[PDB]
Amino acid sequence: ADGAALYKSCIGCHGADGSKAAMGSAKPVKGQGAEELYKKMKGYADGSYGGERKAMMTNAVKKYSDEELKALADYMSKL
Numbered sequence: 001a002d003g004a005a006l007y008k009s010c011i012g013c014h015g016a017d018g019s020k021a022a023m024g025s026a027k028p029v030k031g032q033g034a035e036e037l038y039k040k041m042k043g044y045a046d047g048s049y050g051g052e053r054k055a056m057m058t059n060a061v062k063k064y065s066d067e068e069l070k071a072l073a074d075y076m077s078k079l
């Protein structure tokens with residue numbers, strides 16, 4: 001569905017421009033790279049990836065699925 005809409009909640013930690021180094025100190029999500037973003041989201045979706053707050057991430061990400069994840073990464077890749 002619309003990546004921007006799906007990411008609306010995420011914007012809370014990542015910042016409006018997805019550049020706020022989210023809580024732990026996320027690498028600015030803004031333009032991380034769609035492939036990157038998606039590979040990592042899939043990773044958290046299934047649980048085969050980590051980070052400072054990988055758990056929070058996984059829990060959030062769980063809401064989506066491959067299509068929604070692709071859209072989210074596509075959005076985050078432009079931000």
Ligand code: HEC
Pocket residue numbers: 006007009010011012013014022023024025026027029032037038040041050051052053054056057060061072076
């Ligand atoms: C604050 C508690 C966060 C909320 C809410 C969401 N995200 Fe996040 N995200 C957070 C951190 C600390 C990081 C960096 C990795 C780490 O834990 O060290 C991330 C990362 C992402 C990424 C990129 C992965 C990377 O390696 O940087 C994506 C694609 C991402 N976040 C998506 C995402 C979604 C879909 C959210 C809303 C449902 C969301 N995040 C919320 C911290 C936080």
